[PDB]
């Protein structure tokens, strides 16, 4: 029913996310929610999706790794409207999915005035 759940379910194709096989790296405290550095890695993933559970529109990015990628690491900077959980979901070539989740405290809210 929630948007995170709906997005999560579309990604998993109905399977439950496992754990292990993923690293989600985010600051404990993000001073500036307009620009929060995030790194994800998931050896062997065909894709990693990033969700921000407390944002008005939770979807952040989907990283689709192609054949020319040396490994399944991606780093970017994101907006967080407020203190919240950031979720990474990685899907393997066999279609199994793994989840990592972490709390990011935010001082300055992102997403715009």
């Amino acid at each position: 029913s929630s948007t995170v759940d709906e997005l999560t379910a579309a990604f998993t194709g109905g399977a439950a996310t496992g754990e292990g096989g993923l690293t989600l790296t985010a600051p404990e405290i993000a001073e500036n929610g307009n620009t929060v550095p995030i790194e994800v890695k998931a050896p062997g993933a065909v894709a990693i999706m990033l969700l921000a559970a407390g944002n008005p529109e939770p979807a952040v990015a989907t990283f689709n790794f192609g054949p020319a990628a040396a490994d399944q690491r991606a780093a970017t900077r994101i907006r967080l409207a407020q203190t919240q959980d950031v979720i990474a979901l990685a899907k393997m070539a066999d279609g199994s999915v793994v989840k990592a989740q972490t709390t990011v405290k935010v001082t300055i809210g992102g997403c715009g005035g």
């Binding site: 979807a59 990015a61 790794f65 490994d71 780093a75 409207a81």
Partner: protein, 108 residues
């Protein structure tokens, strides 16, 4: 959009089969759709919604981008350089613009 200037940092050569780190940035407001004007009305979204990096025509990464990616979107990822040729970087704007950058890579 105007002044969407790509900046890519990547070695100009590598040993055959070696990993290189790619850093790809472009200047863009990424108007989120959540910002309010002086009157409290929402300012409509207009972002880069997709970024691709190809090495010698084969995909390195393809990123579906949403409004929570920051202003001046930044992507860092790792490419396996098996042979010489070029990286091609493409950013797709909500407004219909397509931004491109091309970077040569040698094998030494």
């Amino acid at each position: 959009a105007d002044d969407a200037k790509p900046r890519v940092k990547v070695p100009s050569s590598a040993k055959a089969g070696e990993t290189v780190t790619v850093k790809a940035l472009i200047s863009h407001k990424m108007e989120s759709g959540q910002r309010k004007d002086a009157d409290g009305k929402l300012i409509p979204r207009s972002i880069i919604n997709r970024f691709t990096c190809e090495l010698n025509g084969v995909n390195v990464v393809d990123v579906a981008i949403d409004p929570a990616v920051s202003t001046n979107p930044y992507f860092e990822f790792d490419a396996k350089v098996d042979a010489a040729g070029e990286f091609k970087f493409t950013w797709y704007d909500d407004d219909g613009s397509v931004y491109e950058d091309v970077k040569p890579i040698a094998v030494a």
